[PDB]
From Swiss-Prot, chains B, C:
GO molecular function: 3-hydroxy-9,10-secoandrosta-1,3,5(10)-triene-9,17-dione monooxygenase activity; acyl-CoA dehydrogenase activity; flavin adenine dinucleotide binding
First-level EC class: oxidoreductase
Full protein name: Flavin-dependent monooxygenase, oxygenase subunit HsaA
Binding site for FMN: W78, S112, S113, Y114, W135, S136, S137, A318, T319, H340, A341
GO cellular component, as recorded: cytoplasm
High-level lineage: Bacteria, Bacillati, Actinomycetota, Actinomycetes, Mycobacteriales
Gene name as annotated: hsaA
A Pfam family the protein falls into: Acyl-CoA_dh_2
GO BP terms in the entry: fatty acid beta-oxidation using acyl-CoA dehydrogenase; steroid biosynthetic process
Signal peptide positions on this chain: none
């Protein structure tokens, strides 16, 4: 079993997922059956390190899988991209954190809410974490979470990064009643006085430094991809895929099909350019990372324009609750509102360690 | 004595300030003589409330004053602007805080370092504040300071604002050995385990809300000016004056549009201040689109100004590099200003829409 | 020992030169240690003729050497470029002048001040020279100098060029207290009633004519490079290296196109040098259109470079102003360079078409 065969297995899975699209929406979280299928097929394995049975794959393939899923159910491609890429992010934590998550069951999953809605206060051996973090897509299908925030020491921020916390230490609050991406169950994680040892914190500085502890044991070049590319592409790729779905909803019933194609080639082109340099042991130029950032909005912007045109060119029946196209329209738009509210848009401007953050140019 | 006579009297000061310019750089902080002079002619009263003997003046006149000062000594104009506008900011604090600062001596001055380099953790009665804040322009001439940062409650940020703290409770570390703005004495403020009561913190949300406590006792329309305009104009105005200085220095030693770019940058900057103030004087609200223009104009004004200073610096003879040449000083002072402006965290705060770090919605900051 | 091994050996020098950078500024002239080091690895021989033990090297390699030096210490790269290229210039003087400088010690160095700040009046046997010439970079490390000016005969200018004069015949006035390029010791040369024989003047007409006396004994193709390219590249190359320095300093302390603008400015500058040299190596003539491109590229390269240094300076943190920050130094050194380039009289000489002041036709100067 390999990257290519997982992709094929996913292709085979699409009709089932398409027929439960509306069910998924009504549930407000992915059906266990979708999650079980994705697991069985090896999807969560794609960016997971080899030492845990994972395929540490070309990131372009991982994002292609998310595009396929999204083309059939916006919510499913969204949750899959986000929860699958967390296996990439965990590969960068020190080896003991990876063991604690994967050492018994390597199919264990990890959710996130990286927005700074809490903080870790330095205590002996780690941090005491408190906060209430919203928007954790797929959190009902993960037994660990990341939560983002600053580290506070002697009453001041000194660092910023992600805290890894097991499910027994947080509560999920069901708040997910929304206009689109309804089936993502992007619920709220409530964290009260939870001790987190240092080995289960990973600083944004270290990730962008190439000094993340996971890199000593996980050497595949995909783990050297920049955070500033992997993180927004996680969101952009399914949104592009939802445009493929809107288009196929419009057939099954101008420049559209090809404006969508061009949005895809641009988004993924930056990923493979980046990866091709790492696989040849070269460095990724800042200019390339800056270019990939600007193309996030160009590509989701082009996709969503195509979706709006299609939505308005599908008969009056387009407005019906019973109509796939309005679902892909709502889901892509919900996605872009999430994207447009991303606090890293601002982090990139910081140059002076504000709130424990790394130099902004490292975040690009 | 009104705003117009203060402005008139600042004019009488310019020759003396100009002469002292190298001495000011050498001191690395403003000479007592120039601070006393400015205090005597009433400069610090300009934006101070009338209940304290201030002129609560037209904010465009206050910025014009700083432009003139900076046209003779960049560091003097810089410190004057920043230290004077803090009398505006204290006016929005609740009356008890104002009483503590000014109740005995209404000539008392307040420095700032608004960058988040510390925090206040909620305790009984207020906040325990800790941090180390740099770039506090004119701090050696103040007996209180503002320091910016979040409020931490129950182990997380829940608000963001300024803590007002007396001079007995922090240490000034002298670290100001720099390429430009040498006479501003922009030193570092070290604060350890300092209790700040609630009436001495003012949230950015409250200021932008029109709910700041000081508004209940300071009713003048100037106190209704937006933070997102007043705060950067504090910096941009003396940088613009520094371009007027470079120009005069270039004329004295001997482009197509150096002179007219500088005057256009000025009309544009002070224009947004006048438009906003004109609405508040009429009992009207400032629209978001106006505050938005005023923000984009900060870089345009200061960018045009600095570009012209650059052409001037390059067209004043091969001696323009000499330490004795006024034009290298305006050039260094102006560029140093620009580095400060480009390092302002509020350029990022405007983008935040989700209460990140206790901050208010970013569009309120614009 | 060839040009390639010298370049290799300069690389070994860079760490030591970088460390000395603040010390160099403080001295206000290059430390003996760095001049000796450069002399020892053979740097000054690069463009010196083979009859004197020089390498009469590919001029693109000489400029690369200065780029590397300036990427660690702007002042060192600046002085190195200017003092080294004068061994190129002396090669065009007639053999008797070269013999006077180098006949005993071929390691002897020559400073310049080519700006017309003096004149030579025709006398029996040569010229009586008088003047006061500033900005002579590295003059404290030379035992001869060039000074530029017209020849006055029968009461009017009849020619224009450089007079070569030994150290015993002028005074160095120490006047170098400046905002940037502080370690270059660009001091002033005072010359009073000095007899210069005819073999120690070289006309700009003769150089541009291909009739310089030194060409009869120094046949290497490099001696055929145009003045109008070699002379400004001397300045532009280390300014470009200074941008490479600012970049490295910004990376070390922690734009879209800062790095790639800098490398594009370099390819463009060194590209015109390579194209010209490639024609001379083939026994071919350099066309006017190529020298013309090379001139317009001096401002483009140096402009792009400085713009990038400016973005960098503004994006390296609020401490970028500190005297201890490498990036302010590259910034000041680069801008100081630019003031020198913008004050060059040859920008005007190119426009003259009528022998004004003894000058050759302006298109020969391009």
């Amino acid at each position: 079993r390999d990257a290519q065969s997982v992709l094929a297995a996913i292709d085979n899975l699409l009709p089932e997922i398409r027929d439960r699209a509306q069910a998924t929406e009504d549930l407000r979280r992915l059906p266990d059956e979708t999650v079980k299928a994705l697991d069985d097929v090896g999807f969560f394995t794609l960016l997971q390190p080899q030492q845990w049975g994972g395929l540490q794959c070309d990131p372009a393939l991982f994002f292609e899988a998310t595009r396929r899923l999204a083309s059939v159910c916006g919510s499913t491609g969204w949750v899959s991209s986000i929860v699958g890429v967390h296996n990439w992010h965990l590969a960068l934590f020190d080896q003991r954190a990876q063991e604690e998550v994967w050492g018994e069951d390597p199919s264990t999953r990890i959710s996130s809410s990286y927005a700074p809605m809490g903080a870790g206060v330095v205590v002996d051996g780690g941090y005491l974490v408190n906060g209430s973090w919203n928007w954790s897509s797929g959190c009902d299908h993960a037994s660990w979470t990341f939560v983002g925030g600053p580290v506070i020491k002697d009453g001041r921020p000194v660092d910023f990064g992600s805290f890894l916390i097991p499910r027994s230490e947080y509560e999920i609050k069901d708040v997910w009643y929304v206009v689109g991406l309804r089936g993502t169950g992007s619920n709220t994680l409530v964290v009260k006085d939870v001790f987190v040892p240092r080995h289960r914190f990973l600083s944004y500085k270290a990730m962008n430094d190439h000094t993340a502890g996971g890199l000593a044991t996980n050497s595949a070049p995909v783990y050297k991809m920049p955070w500033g590319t992997m993180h927004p592409t996680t969101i952009s790729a399914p949104i592009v895929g939802m445009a493929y779905g809107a288009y196929a909803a419009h057939v099954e019933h101008a420049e559209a099909a090809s404006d969508i194609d061009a949005a895809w080639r641009q988004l993924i082109g930056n990923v493979s350019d980046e990866y091709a340099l790492l696989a040849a042991g070269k460095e990724i130029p800042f200019e390339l990372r800056a270019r990939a950032r600007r193309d996030q909005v160009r590509a989701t912007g082009r996709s969503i324009a195509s979706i709006d045109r299609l939505f308005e060119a599908s008969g009056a029946t387009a407005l019906s609750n019973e109509a796939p196209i309005q679902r892909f329209w709502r889901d892509a738009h919900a996605g872009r509102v999430h994207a447009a509210n991303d606090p890293e848009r601002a982090y990139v401007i910081f140059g002076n360690h504000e709130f424990g953050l790394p130099p902004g140019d490292t975040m690009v």
